[PDB]
Symmetry: D2
Subunit: 365 residues, 4 copies
């Protein structure tokens, strides 16, 4: 099996000097800090461990190419794009919309290459050039709506790829399965009225955004019943996550019969991530990818692919990400340095949410 | 009259080696520049105290080093000898647990850390101060009688309690530790002793993974005088406040300690990487206010707060400031992220209530 | 009685977004976390003052903001207003020289910096203190009447000079700048004024590249009362001390100022990236000592030191500490680099420059 | 066809402990997050080769570990044994400033093997030239001792390989790192089969070696040439040194391989020198080397990374050398001094040109 791997040095050049929840603000006494949350070193360490662990030998490198305006404009409005162009034009950079999201001088080039990364991987998976793959792209995508960039996301990478698989490669049912610890409100908005894209987001209840991602947000029109949120409570771990994957997401995908599954693969649900209270360990992420690999092999011949979302622990993210790479290559080259107390047992209030979400599968056809 | 202990040397801890993710080429753990226990976190706290204007309400206390005699009231010579040996190596070295590291001459800072808790204790018992905050480093609550571990060389609060007992003649002392990790060192040091009541509220099963459960109540004459509240992952201000009101405050009232020492960690904060708790800065203020309140009711406001863990350089300074503000009565700066876990949940309540039964055995 | 001016806000300057190497994707200047003017350099100076015991021989002096009036004695209203413009912006901005940057609310640090030089000046002039050191930040000596530049928003030493004259009644002040770069701002501010003798010893043609020559000597009432000493790249203790003993001290003796103000930068040190000078800590100590001595000989010891530039986080603390030991007399601690790396001999082409400058003394009256 | 050697592991060197400014509470040297030899400096260089598009003109070359035998062609067993011992621990290796993390010998092996891989492909004709962006550096290690961030003398290891395995009889090592290549000088001191040239800042490091009178011994008298430039020297002194000493020494000796020890610590922003070389000075130095390489041995020269300590400016100095080899200039120096040739500088180069007479 050829397993694609999308990486480019530019992904590690996102400018995070300004911006963020804790931007320097002398008036409010927020002291300048050296390492901001979305500092590029977290995903760079992931890439660098892929190299030095030998997993790269089982992988086929895939060079990304810039997405075009037309690729972006299939899901995003011209207002959003021209805004990102004009902010990226300024010297020193600029806020983009929600204050937290920063676009540096010329930063749009990285957003273009990031989105094209997801498209290159898609093109190679649907053609048969590759059985699956991992696109370690940055900046992330899943918070960008039809109208707005937010949450570090300029463009909705996975949605741009799903619209590419549909509008150019002729697919008719796609599923975007997003396990980033925050709700994928961007993806949910883009496909809100559309049943040709099943969108699923499992996430921490009320984390980001604080007012979206609830069970009863289900789509509308032709889209009703083709958006599914699993909002787990803080503290959930491998127990809750695997239970959710087995009772809800895998039966949901079996029902919908997608011809391509795109995983929004974030790792901010990790046990050490500063922007969650979830307890997923790297082996949990391994079992998560395998379940998705497996059901994909059952139905659409392994046509699935993983695209990086968030993740903020420079220490532990590389091993979470490497664990998912191993589930694609089936070679174990290296142990988790934390190879196990907390989060592995399924708690009844964690179960009460997943049982509720399992009833939603009946409305998928 | 509110003391504040700080010294520049507390921010000179060398954190280049060690950590759970200490560089290891064979295991492919890449060197990183910012380890978890980097000095920037507690340095940003002390600088916010300065630039928020709180310092105008605070009486600075210069710390002096603890003696060997002060460390030996609670630690075995083996522990102290070990730290002198490692502190002597030219490059420093691992203290024993392959996580804690002590730089060359780093024992100087460990003495100063403990002495800072002793200077605050001296001045509060004597009446020179009403209460205070000692922002010391390295922290203490994981050091047992025999073993340094978890970034702790010396058990600062225990050294302070022992000093208050054996030198200042106190008979009854309580240590209240709200660091998110079980204070296993304090538990071990006073296991057999009813004259220091030890209470740890912490995340169930975080660190160390083999301690902190309800059934660890002490031994011998000390049975009933160690109390653990292990909250579930995800607990926030509602479980913590509820725990302080149904367990910790009734317990102190019953025990009637001549002095309360709080081990003030902030790694239970909503943003800390080493916890899954959701306490906010407002949450920490109330917890502090409740200890003052109970301290003013039963022993004459004789309480003080001694820094333990905390690893979020963005949000810890505001959690520390909120505790300082609860000591001064003066609000001077808003928490910038306060725009959650404020609702108490059945499974958090069930732990807290099971713990309230244990108050009966405190006499 | 030795004053020491420090404040935590001096280490809170926002420097993650600007400078010669500001992030520019188009030019492929990759984002970096430590810029040249990072506050850790001067913070480590202050912390070494604390941890060495020198603080026990010093009188801490608390700074208060300079007013607009203090700033306007030497700067055009456009400069002051342009500082408020940039400072109020969310996330700051370029002050208008593509190198200098003002954080959000950062004008408050600018005010407190000039305030720190005023407060030491007041306390020294009034006899309350004999001398002192103001470890202020940002530096000042590049700011002209019209323009902020080179990390300097306000000319701190010139604002303290103008305060001593127009409020405390002094008629003769001398500003001696040993920052490795030319004090173009001090020279410009007092170009036409003889009541402020301005001396700058610098690296010939570093920053600005178009000033600092011997033939710049003032105009009007000010002719002969500006003195530039442009030493060659490579100069160290041998040339710096010869320049002090043959030009700067004789010029001060001839001038008989009521107060001597030292712009004390440490960027001429052997390890500083932004110069090619080889001064060591013992050189900076002797330089401070010579000023102290001529000042105790003529104007009753009325001199003080205001921090300017310096960019070696490893070595600046010991250079700055060495200057304090000249003030306090107390040797607490040894320079951990004592040396044979060069510069202690006075080379011929270095004397050629100093000797020329010594002729300019004849026109100081 | 131009080779480029890089491996992710070269940026995994552990620079947390050690250094001339290693933390020391009794000397009150405060711990610092960024030491002088931090991997970021050479990682940025590599990442600029990627993002500038120079990589599209380059042939990537995977490095392979030098073997113990490779090391022992030029180093004593004690040096090698000392490194395995220090590497097995969870330490300092020789001169206090050189530090080797646990298992760090793996990277030193990979560093020397990188300079061997480039050398093989350049001799074989598979490549015309190339650049080996290896770490840790090498030119300070002698037969007996590692020192100055240098575990193994990479360029000397590659020169021994080119001779014993590949059959070359004359090799030249040109070292333009700002510090004296005392290691290389020591390894080939009695040997005329390796012309060793070092241009460095007079008395910088080590403070006690690098002088003109140090010309070799025995068979090797006349085949070691030191050019010790005065502090403050720049593009002027350096280009005059190359046109008037280094190139003519190389034309006279006629080596079959030129190995450049390529350091950028002579650059205008480096904290560890007082030299004023700019990115165009390095490009010009590289170009003179290629020019004489094509005139006298068919373009058989290669560049091996030594020192350099400015994360901001080093990447553009290294890009400038890559641009020289590729002939494709796709990016400007954002900073673009000592372009003038000073008499005390010329006095040094002039005395050195006299030395070319004893090269045969
Ligand atoms: Cl942030
Ligand atoms: Cl760590
Ligand atoms: Cl910069
Ligand atoms: Cl260093
Ligand atoms: K999600
Ligand atoms: K949908
Ligand atoms: K007890
Ligand atoms: K605790
Ligand atoms: K003047
Ligand atoms: K100057
Ligand atoms: K050299
Ligand atoms: K030789
Ligand atoms: Zn996220
Ligand atoms: Zn802790
Ligand atoms: Zn300067
Ligand atoms: Zn070097």
């Amino acid at each position: 099996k050829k397993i694609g791997y999308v990486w480019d040095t530019l992904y590690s050049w996102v400018d995070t000097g300004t911006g963020g929840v804790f931007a320097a603000n002398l008036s409010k006494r927020i002291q300048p800090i050296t390492h901001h949350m979305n500092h590029p070193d977290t995903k760079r360490r992931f890439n660098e461990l892929v190299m030095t662990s030998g997993q790269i030998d089982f992988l086929t490198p895939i060079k990304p190419y810039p997405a075009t305006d037309a690729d972006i404009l299939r899901v995003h409005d011209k207002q959003l794009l021209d805004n990102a162009k004009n902010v990226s034009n300024k010297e020193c950079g600029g806020d983009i919309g929600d204050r937290v999201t920063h676009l540096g001088n010329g930063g749009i080039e990285i957003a273009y290459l990031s989105a094209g990364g997801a498209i290159e991987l898609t093109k190679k998976v649907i053609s048969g050039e590759l059985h699956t793959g991992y696109a370690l792209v940055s900046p992330p995508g899943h918070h960008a709506t039809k109208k707005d960039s937010m949450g570090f996301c300029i463009f909705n990478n996975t949605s741009i790829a799903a619209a590419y698989a549909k509008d150019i490669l002729g697919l008719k049912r796609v599923a975007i399965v997003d396990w980033d610890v925050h709700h994928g409100n961007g993806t949910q908005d883009i496909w809100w009225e559309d049943s040709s894209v099943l969108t699923i987001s499992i996430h921490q209840n009320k984390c980001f955004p604080t007012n979206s991602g609830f069970i009863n947000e289900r789509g509308a029109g032709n889209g009703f019943g083709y958006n599914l949120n699993i909002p787990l409570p803080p503290g959930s771990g491998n127990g809750a996550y695997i239970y959710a994957f087995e009772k809800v997401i895998v039966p949901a995908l079996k029902k919908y019969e997608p011809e391509l599954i795109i995983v929004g693969s974030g790792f901010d649900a990790s046990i050490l991530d500063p922007l969650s209270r979830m307890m997923v360990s790297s082996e949990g992420f391994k079992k998560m990818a395998s379940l998705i690999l497996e059901v994909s092999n059952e139905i659409n011949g392994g046509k699935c692919l993983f695209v990086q979302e968030g993740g903020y622990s420079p220490h532990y993210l590389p091993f979470c990400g490497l664990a998912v790479i191993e589930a694609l290559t089936g070679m174990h080259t290296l142990d988790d340095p934390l190879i196990e107390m907390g989060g592995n047992e399924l708690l009844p209030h964690e179960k009460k949410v997943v049982d509720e979400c399992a009833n939603l599968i009946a409305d998928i056809n």
